[PDB]
Amino acid sequence: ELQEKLIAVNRVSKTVKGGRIFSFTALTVVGDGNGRVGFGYGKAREVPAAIQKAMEKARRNMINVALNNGTLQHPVKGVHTGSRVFMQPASEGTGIIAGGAMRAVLEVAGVHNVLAKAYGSTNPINVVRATIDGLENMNSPEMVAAKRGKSVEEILG
RNA sequence: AAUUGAAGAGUUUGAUCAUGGCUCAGAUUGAACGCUGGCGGCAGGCCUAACACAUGCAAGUCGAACGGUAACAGGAAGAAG
């Protein structure tokens, strides 16, 4: 129903006097499949507790995304910490043409035809914040006609 | 009707985010090499020595331009078998 999807599991260290003590970080994205999407980071000492802590963070950080018939509205960009992400509406692009950690966030939002490309750093944590900054900044023709033109037949044409 | 088209990964660190190279997954070739090998179709086939070349062939034709008769096949005569 909410399409839980783990992206990456890492292994981080802390370096104490005894030695190095390890823990695990997860990155999971959830979403219904009609324009709601959220990621949660999560970290714990073992692997399945780190993924489960990511699931609880991802459910309470969902946003709203406007999509036209399972695809985007317009070409939009997204920037977060050296991760520049470009995305196209791809009018029947027929497939989520996106890279690692950019494909997974677009599968759970419900969007199906994107030509996407990630420039800069492709660190998996930062590119998920780059796409989510790109998707909620994207506006529908109903929102643009609500503030400009005052007619959806006059805004689009 | 005459284009509908854009994926990333590994590796600097105890771990991190950056920067930044290296490397890989793709397609292609007048290809070569190794192993293997049934048929057909359509193509392609000295990229190096514009190095050197045995032998054959690759530009002849026209008698309705002309003098002609070296052959060839007949004819016309002359003989004689």
Curated annotation (Swiss-Prot):
One of its GO terms (molecular function) is rRNA binding. Disulfide bonds: none annotated. Residues 2-65 form the S5 DRBM domain. GO terms for cellular component: cytoplasm; cytosol; cytosolic small ribosomal subunit. Gene3D superfamilies: 3.30.160.20, 3.30.230.10. It comes from the Bacteria. Keywords: Acetylation, Antibiotic resistance, Ribonucleoprotein, Ribosomal protein, RNA-binding, rRNA-binding. Part of the 30S ribosomal subunit. Contacts proteins uS4 and uS8. With proteins uS4 and uS5 encircles the mRNA as it enters the ribosome, which may play a role in mRNA helicase processivity. Can be cross-linked to mRNA. In collided ribosomes contacts ribosome rescue factor SmrB. Altered uS5 proteins have been identified in a number of mutants. Some mutations in uS5 have been shown to increase translational error frequencies. With uS4 and uS12 plays an important role in translational accuracy. Many suppressors of streptomycin-dependent mutants of protein uS12 are found in this protein, some but not all of which decrease translational accuracy (ram, ribosomal ambiguity mutations). Located at the back of the 30S subunit body where it stabilizes the conformation of the head with respect to the body. Belongs to the universal ribosomal protein uS5 family. NCBIfam families: rpsE_bact. PANTHER family: MITOCHONDRIAL RIBOSOMAL PROTEIN S5. This is Small ribosomal subunit protein uS5. It comes from Escherichia coli (strain K12). The gene is rpsE.
